[PDB]
C-alpha cells in the first residue's frame, strides 16, 4: 500500500474491511456527539470535530495555544493534546466509534440477493427478524447432550404430561361431582325440568371447558417438546413465547441469541470449506431449481473461501468516522451555519451508542435494551445507505438526510444518468456569430474575453517588458485595462490555440482547436464551415472556450485537434468542411449553364466571324466586367493554367500535358473557369454543374489524393467564392415567386368527386367506418401526388424556391409542395392520418380547422424530438460503456480469417451492377486474401486499402467477393490490431496505434440517432444492441426441406420437415397477426426452406440465430440489421464501427459443463481466458469444460468487465461495488475510465508508452553547428 498518493498506482484493490483495520485507520475513538462550543466556536473535545483526534484547525497551532510555529512540529502539547502540524490533516485522518453491540453493514443484508442471506443460507425475510431484534434464533446446540440425555429428558417430559393429566382428571372429577350435585339439587325438588337440564348442560359446558384447557395445555407441551427435539442452529423461534417457555428447560443444552451479535456467533460457528463442499456436491448431483439456488449460494461461498477474507467482517464492530473536512461545518457570513448532513447521522449513532452503553452499565430489563440495540442498528443502517430499509431518516422539509451511500460522486443508480463533470478553470462561453472572413483554422474571439483567459500569460509578458515593476501592478493594470495591455495581448495570443466545445458534444468533432484572433464585440466569431460539425446554427447557440496550458497540451491542440486537420467525419469518412447552404447556392449559380445567354459561342461565318472565343480567362473576365459576357454563357476559352479533363488530355497531349504553361481550348462558361481556378493546379478540369453531390465528390477526391493542408485551403477558397456568387444569384422569396399550380382547382375537384362517392358509399353502408377512412386516405394520397407532379412541372428551372432545392443546398421538395400546392394529410395525435384533409398551401393561408389540425402534427413532432434526443444519449452512454476498452494495440495481428463483403453482386443479364451499400462495408478495409481475375492473375493482393481505384479494378475484373479483415476476426487478445481495423475514416490513412476506436465507434453510432425519426426506429436499434427478443418474433428454421405448415384456430401452425430428417421442429403458438416470409414469393405449406430462413415477418432474435448458425451468422445479422435502420433514415455509418461494438457482445462463452476446472456451470467467462484454462487443463489430466458462445447484450457485457473501478460506475454502483468487495477483486488500471478518474494519464492517444516515453535530442550534425 502506497497511501501517500504520488504517481504510482499499479493496482487499486478493494476488500471488505474488518474491525481490526477500521480501528487501525482511526486516530481516536470519538465519544461525544458534540460539534462546536456554541460560543467560542472551537471544536469540542471528543466531538465530531475534535482537534485532538482529527487534527489542528490552525496551521501549526495546538488547542491550548502553547505552540505556534513550524519549529514545533510533529510534537503534541501534553496539556491540550494536539499534533502541531498542518491544518489539512483534518482532511485525511479518520475516527472510529466503539459500538456496544455489533451491527450488520446494510450493504450485506438488504441488497438483493442478500449476501448474509446466502452465506448463512437463510430467508432474508427471516434474517430481518433475526438482526432487527424481532425474533430469536438458535445459534448453537449440544447435539451429543441432547442425544444421550434424551432418554431421561423425554422421561421427564412424560412425567410432566402425566402431571398435566392429573390436573386434567382432577378438573374432570371436580366438574363431574359439581354437576352431579347439580342433578341431585335438580331432582331433589320439583320445578321446570328444562332448568335442571340447563344445569346439566352448564356443568357439561364447564367440563368441556376442562377438556379444552387440557387439550390446549397438551398442545403447548407438545409444541415445546417437538421444538426441543428438532432444535438445531439457524432456526427461528418466532413469537418468543415458545422460546420463553423453552429456555428455562434445557438452557444448558444450546444457545439462542437475537440480533447482530447472533449473526456474529453464527458466522463464527461456520466452516466455509465444509459448506462449499456441500454445495459442490449438490451442484454436482441435485437437479432442478435446487441446483440454481446451490449455484447462487456457491457464488458468495467460494468468494469468501478463495480469497483471504473472512465473512466475520460483514457484521460491523466499530463504525469509522469520515474526516471532519469531508463533512464540514462552514459558517456563511452572518452567523448562520451550514453542516454536511452527515453530522446529524453521526450524532444519532453516537447518542444511541452512549445510551446503550449506559443502559447496559445500569442494568435494564431486556425489552428496553433490545429496543436500544434495534435503534442502534437502524441508525447505523441510515448512516451507511439511507432509507434503504424503512423510511428514510428525514430532517426539515421532509427531505431525507443525504447519507454516505449517496455522497459517492459517480454513483449510477439503476438508470444510467449523465456524469456532468468538474467545471474546469481557464474557461468561458459566449454566443457565436458567423465569421465569413476567417481562414478555416481561426476563431473570432472577444478581446474583452481573451484578456481574461490569458491574464496570467499577459501578466508575465508585460512584466518582462518594463511596463510594470511587479506581478501585482500588472494584475491591477489588467483590472484597469491600461492601453498597452492590448498590444501585449496580441503577442501572447499569437500561435496559441484555444478549444471550442459546443454542448451537447455528440461526436468527436464537438471539440476543435483554432487559432484565436482578436475581434471587436462580445461574440465568438466562428468559421462557417465548422457549423456542420458542431451542429451549430446561429439562432443564439453558445460555445465554450477552454484553454490548453501545458506544452504537451498545446501540442495536442495544435496537431490532433486543429480544425484544418479534421475535414472528414470519423463516422463515415465523408467531408464536413464541405460547402453548404449559402455557398452551395453560390457555386451552383456560378457554374450552371444558361443557354441563350449573353455573348455565347455563336458560330456562323459568311456574315461574321465566330464571336464566341475568348483568348484566355483574362480577356473573358475583362469582357464580363464590361457588359458583354455573362458569367454563365457557354463560351470557348483558351486556357493555359488548368489541367484539362482526362479525355482531352489524352487526345492533345497523350502522356501528360504538364499543364503549367500549355494550351488548349475547352468550351465551357467563364464561371466554370473561375471555379476550376479555385481547385489546385494538378486537378483535372471539371466542366459540370456544381451540384452539392458533385462538390462532395470533388472534395472526397481531393482529400483522398492530396495532402490535408491543400484540402483545407481549397475548401476555404470554395467558401469565399460561394458566398460571393451567392449574393449575385438573387435567390429571394417574394410571394410573387411562390407560384401556385394554375390547375389546382380541377385536380382537387376530381379527387373530391372520388372521395365524395366513397363517403356516399359509406352512407350506403356498403363499406364500414375503417374502410371509408382507408379509402379516403388513399384518395388524398393520390391527390397529393398529382398536385406535387403538376407543381414541379409548373415551376421554371430558375425559380428561387426551386433553385435552392434542386441545387441540393437545402430543403426537400415536400416543403415546396407545402408552400404552394397542398399540405396533404395531417397526422392525428395518435398517429393515424386525418381523413379531412388539409387542402391549402401556406401561400394561400389555411382556415381555422386546417390550422388546428396541423397543430397536432406540429406539437407531436416537437415532443417526440425531445424524447428522442433524450434517448439517443442513453444509447450512446451504453455504447461508450461497452467499448471503452477497444483500442488499437498492434500494427498487425497477422491472422488469416476475416469476413467476406458483398462488393457488387452479379447481374442476371450478366454485368457487375455495383452493390448499393458498398461505400460503407467495402471501402476502407484491408484484404485478407488475394483478389484474382479470370481464375488467373492477381489483381489486388493481401493487405491493401480498398479505396476507389482497387474497388474499381475489381468491378472491372468482374469479381464479386473479397475476404477482407475486420475487427470481428482480429486475433489480438487486448483489443483490436490495426490492419484488421483498416483505414481510419478520419485521416484517410491506416489507423494509428492508440486510437480509442471503441469510443469512436460508440460515438459514431449514437450521434446520428437524434436524426432517427422512425418496431422500426431507435427502439429497434436499442433492443437490437441489448439483444432482447423482439416483439415481432419470427421463428427461424433448424434444417432445410419443405415446410410443415398449418393454419389452426385463430392463428397458424408451423412445423419443420427436416431432410435427414428427424424430430420435426414444431412451432405451434404463433399469432394470426404475423405473416409468412415472402422471399426467393410468399411462403406456403410445403415450401423447401433454408437452414436458418426467417419464417414469419418481423425480426429473429439474435439468441436463436446464434444457437442455430454459429457466431458468424449472428454477427452478419447484427451488422446488417442495424445498418438497415441507419440507411432507412438516410445516414452513413461505416460498418467497422458497428463491428467494433458487436465484437464486444460476442466475447464470452457459457459454461455448460465445468468438467473439473474451477468453473461454475451456467456462468459466463471470456473466450480467451476460457481457451487459456483449457490449454492449461489439457495437461495435468483432461476435463475440457463444455463451452458455448453467448450473445449477451451490451449492458450485461459492460457490467461484467474486469475493472471494478470502471464496472462500478455503470449501473447499480452500490451492488457492483459491494460484491466487488466480497470478491476482493484487484483492479489493474488498464482501461480509460479508471485512469481518467484517478488523474493518471490515459492509455490511449498519446498515453501509451510507445509515445509517452519518447526521447528527443538534437541530431549530432545540428549539435555541431549550434
Amino acid at each position: 500500500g502506497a497511501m501517500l498518493d504520488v504517481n504510482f498506482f499499479d493496482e487499486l484493490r478493494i476488500g471488505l474491511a474488518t474491525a481490526e483495520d477500521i480501528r487501525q485507520w482511526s486516530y481516536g475513538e470519538v465519544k461525544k456527539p458534540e460539534t462546536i462550543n456554541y460560543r467560542t466556536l472551537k471544536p469540542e473535545k471528543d466531538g465530531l470535530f475534535c482537534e485532538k483526534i482529527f487534527g489542528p484547525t490552525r496551521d501549526w497551532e495546538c488547542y491550548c495555544g502553547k505552540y505556534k510555529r513550524v519549529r514545533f512540529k510533529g510534537i503534541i502539547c501534553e496539556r491540550c493534546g494536539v499534533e502541531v502540524t498542518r491544518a489539512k490533516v483534518r482532511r485525511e485522518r479518520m475516527g472510529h466509534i466503539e459500538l456496544a453491540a455489533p451491527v450488520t453493514h446494510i450493504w450485506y443484508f438488504k441488497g438483493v440477493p442478500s449476501r448474509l442471506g446466502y452465506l448463512l443460507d437463510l430467508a432474508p425475510k427471516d434474517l430481518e427478524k433475526i438482526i432487527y431484534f424481532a425474533a430469536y434464533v438458535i445459534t448453537s446446540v449440544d447435539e451429543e447432550m441432547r442425544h444421550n440425555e434424551l432418554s431421561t429428558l423425554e422421561a421427564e417430559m412424560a412425567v410432566e404430561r402425566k402431571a398435566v393429566e392429573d390436573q386434567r382428571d382432577g378438573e374432570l372429577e371436580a366438574r363431574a361431582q359439581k354437576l352431579e350435585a347439580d342433578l341431585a339439587e335438580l331432582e331433589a325438588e320439583g320445578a321446570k325440568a328444562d332448568a335442571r337440564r340447563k344445569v346439566r348442560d352448564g356443568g357439561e359446558r364447564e367440563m368441556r371447558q376442562i377438556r379444552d384447557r387440557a387439550q390446549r395445555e397438551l398442545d403447548r407441551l407438545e409444541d415445546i417438546w417437538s421444538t426441543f427435539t428438532k432444535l438445531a442452529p439457524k432456526q427461528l423461534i418466532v413469537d418468543e413465547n415458545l422460546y420463553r417457555e423453552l429456555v428455562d428447560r434445557y438452557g444448558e443444552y444450546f444457545t439462542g441469541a437475537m440480533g447482530a451479535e447472533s449473526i456474529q456467533k453464527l458466522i463464527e460457528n461456520f466452516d466455509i470449506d465444509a459448506e462449499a463442499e456441500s454445495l459442490r456436491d449438490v451442484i454436482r448431483n441435485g437437479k432442478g431449481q435446487k441446483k440454481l439456488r446451490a449455484l447462487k449460494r456457491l457464488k458468495v461461498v467460494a468468494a469468501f473461501q478463495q480469497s483471504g477474507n473472512s465473512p466475520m467482517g460483514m457484521v460491523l464492530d466499530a463504525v469509522p468516522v469520515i474526516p471532519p473536512e469531508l463533512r464540514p461545518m462552514v459558517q456563511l457570513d452572518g452567523g448562520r451555519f451550514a453542516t454536511s448532513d452527515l453530522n446529524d447521522l453521526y450524532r444519532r449513532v453516537i447518542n444511541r451508542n452512549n445510551r446503550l452503553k449506559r443502559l447496559i452499565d445500569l442494568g435494564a430489563p431486556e425489552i428496553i435494551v433490545n429496543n436500544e440495540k434495534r435503534m442502534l442498528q437502524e441508525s447505523v443502517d441510515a448512516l451507511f445507505d439511507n432509507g434503504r430499509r424503512g423510511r428514510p431518516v428525514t430532517g426539515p422539509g421532509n427531505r431525507p438526510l443525504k447519507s454516505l451511500s449517496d455522497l459517492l460522486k459517480g454513483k449510477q443508480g439503476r438508470f444510467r444518468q449523465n456524469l456532468l463533470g468538474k467545471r474546469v478553470d481557464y474557461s468561458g462561453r459566449s454566443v457565436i456569430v458567423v465569421g465569413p472572413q476567417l481562414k478555416l483554422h481561426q476563431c473570432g474571439l472577444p478581446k474583452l474575453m481573451a484578456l481574461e483567459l490569458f491574464k496570467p500569460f499577459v501578466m508575465k509578458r508585460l512584466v518582462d517588458l518594463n511596463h510594470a515593476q511587479n506581478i501585482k501592478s500588472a494584475k491591477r493594470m489588467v483590472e484597469r485595462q491600461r492601453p498597452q495591455v492590448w498590444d501585449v495581448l496580441e503577442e501572447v495570443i499569437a500561435e496559441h490555440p484555444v478549444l471550442l466545445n459546443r454542448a451537447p458534444t455528440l461526436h468527436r468533432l464537438g471539440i476543435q482547436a483554432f487559432e484565436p484572433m482578436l475581434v471587436e464585440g462580445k461574440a465568438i466569431q466562428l468559421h462557417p464551415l465548422v457549423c456542420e460539425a458542431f451542429n451549430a446554427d446561429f439562432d443564439g447557440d453558445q460555445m465554450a472556450v477552454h484553454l490548453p496550458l501545458s506544452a504537451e497540451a498545446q501540442a495536442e491542440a495544435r496537431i490532433l485537434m486543429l480544425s484544418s486537420n479534421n475535414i472528414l467525419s470519423p463516422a463515415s469518412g465523408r467531408p464536413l468542411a464541405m460547402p453548404r447552404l449559402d455557398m452551395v447556392t453560390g457555386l451552383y449559380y456560378l457554374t450552371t449553364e444558361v443557354p441563350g445567354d449573353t455573348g455565347e459561342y455563336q458560330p456562323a461565318s459568311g456574315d461574321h466571324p465566330e464571336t464566341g472565343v475568348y483568348s484566355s480567362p483574362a480577356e473573358a473576365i475583362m469582357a464580363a466586367d464590361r457588359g458583354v459576357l455573362s458569367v454563365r454563357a457557354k463560351i470557348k476559352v483558351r486556357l493555359t493554367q488548368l489541367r484539362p479533363p482526362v479525355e482531352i488530355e489524352a487526345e492533345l497531349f497523350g502522356h501528360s500535358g504538364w499543364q503549367p504553361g500549355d494550351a488548349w481550348m475547352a468550351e465551357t462558361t467563364l464561371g466554370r473557369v473561375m471555379f476550376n481556378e479555385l481547385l489546385p493546379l494538378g486537378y483535372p478540369f471539371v466542366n459540370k454543374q456544381m451540384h452539392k453531390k458533385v462538390q462532395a465528390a470533388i472534395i472526397n477526391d481531393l482529400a483522398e489524393r492530396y495532402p490535408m493542408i491543400v484540402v483545407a485551403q481549397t475548401v476555404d477558397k470554395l467558401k469565399d467564392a460561394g458566398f460571393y456568387w451567392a449574393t449575385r444569384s438573387g435567390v429571394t422569396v417574394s410571394m410573387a415567386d411562390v407560384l401556385v399550380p394554375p390547375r389546382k382547382k380541377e385536380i382537387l375537384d376530381h379527387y373530391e368527386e372520388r372521395a365524395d362517392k366513397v363517403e356516399k358509399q359509406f352512407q350506403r353502408g356498403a363499406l364500414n367506418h375503417d374502410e371509408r377512412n382507408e379509402a379516403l386516405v388513399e384518395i388524398w394520397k393520390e391527390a397529393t401526388d398529382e398536385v406535387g407532379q403538376a407543381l414541379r412541372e409548373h415551376y421554371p428551372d430558375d425559380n428561387p424556391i426551386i433553385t435552392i432545392v434542386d441545387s441540393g443546398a437545402t430543403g426537400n421538395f415536400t416543403q415546396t409542395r407545402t408552400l404552394a400546392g397542398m399540405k396533404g394529410l395531417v397526422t392525428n395525435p395518435k398517429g393515424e392520418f386525418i381523413p379531412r384533409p388539409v387542402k391549402s398551401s401556406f401561400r394561400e393561408g389555411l382556415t381555422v380547422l386546417e390550422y388546428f389540425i396541423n397543430t397536432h402534427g406540429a406539437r407531436k413532432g416537437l415532443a417526440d424530438t425531445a424524447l428522442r434526443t433524450a434517448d439517443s444519449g442513453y444509447l450512446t452512454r451504453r455504447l461508450v460503456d461497452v467499448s471503452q476498452d477497444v483500442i488499437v494495440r498492434e500494427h498487425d495481428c497477422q491472422t488469416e480469417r476475416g469476413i467476406v463483403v458483398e462488393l457488387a453482386e452479379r447481374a442476371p443479364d450478366g454485368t457487375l451492377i455495383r452493390d448499393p451499400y458498398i461505400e460503407t462495408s467495402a471501402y476502407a478495409r484491408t484484404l485478407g486474401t488475394d483478389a484474382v481475375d479470370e481464375a488467373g492473375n492477381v489483381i489486388v493482393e493481401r493487405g491493401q486499402d480498398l479505396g476507389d481505384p482497387e474497388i474499381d479494378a475489381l468491378l472491372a475484373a468482374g469479381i464479386t467477393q473479397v475476404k477482407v479483415r475486420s475487427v470481428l476476426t482480429c486475433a489480438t487478445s487486448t483489443g483490436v490490431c490495426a490492419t484488421c481495423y483498416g483505414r481510419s475514416m478520419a485521416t484517410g490513412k491506416l489507423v494509428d496505434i492508440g486510437e480509442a476506436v471503441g469510443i469512436v465507434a460508440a460515438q459514431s453510432i449514437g450521434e446520428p440517432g437524434t436524426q432517427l425519426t422512425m418496431t422500426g426506429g431507435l427502439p429497434r436499434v436499442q433492443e437490437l444492441f441489448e439483444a432482447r427478443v423482439p416483439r415481432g418474433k419470427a421463428p427461424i428454421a433448424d434444417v432445410t426441406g419443405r415446410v410443415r405448415l398449418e393454419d389452426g384456430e385463430r392463428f397458424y401452425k408451423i412445423t419443420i420437415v427436416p431432410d435427414d430428417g428427424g424430430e420435426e421442429v414444431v412451432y405451434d403458438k404463433i399469432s394470426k397477426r404475423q405473416r409468412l416470409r415472402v422471399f426467393k414469393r410468399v411462403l406456403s405449406d410445403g415450401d423447401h426452406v433454408e437452414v436458418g430462413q426467417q419464417l414469419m415477418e418481423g425480426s429473429a432474435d439474435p439468441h436463436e440465430v446464434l444457437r442455430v448458425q454459429g457466431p458468424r451468422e449472428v454477427q452478419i445479422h447484427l451488422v446488417r440489421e442495424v445498418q438497415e435502420v441507419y440507411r432507412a433514415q438516410g445516414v452513413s455509418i461505416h460498418d467497422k464501427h458497428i463491428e467494433v461494438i458487436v465484437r464486444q457482445m460476442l466475447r464470452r462463452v457459457t459454461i455448460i459443463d465445468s468438467g473439473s476446472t474451477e468453473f461454475l456451470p451456467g456462468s459466463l467467462i471470456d473466450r480467451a481466458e476460457f481457451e487459456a484454462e483449457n490449454r492449461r487443463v489439457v495437461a495435468e489430466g483432461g476435463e475440457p469444460a463444455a463451452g458455448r458462445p453467448v450473445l449477451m447484450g451490451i449492458t450485461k457485457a459492460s457490467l461484467a468487465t474486469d475493472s471494478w473501478l470502471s464496472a462500478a460506475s455503470f449501473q447499480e454502483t452500490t451492488r457492483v461495488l459491494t460484491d466487488a468487495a466480497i470478491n476482493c477483486r484487484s483492479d489493474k488500471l488498464n482501461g480509460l475510465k479508471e485512469n481518467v478518474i484517478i488523474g493518471k494519464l490515459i492509455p490511449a492517444g498519446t498515453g501509451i508508452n510507445r509515445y509517452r516515453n519518447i526521447a528527443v535530442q538534437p541530431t549530432e550534425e545540428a549539435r555541431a553547428a549550434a
Binding site: 500500500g1 499499479d10 487499486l12 484487484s1226
Partner: peptide, 4 residues
C-alpha cells in the same frame, strides 16, 4: 492503493 498497491504500488508493486
Amino acid at each position: 492503493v498497491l504500488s508493486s
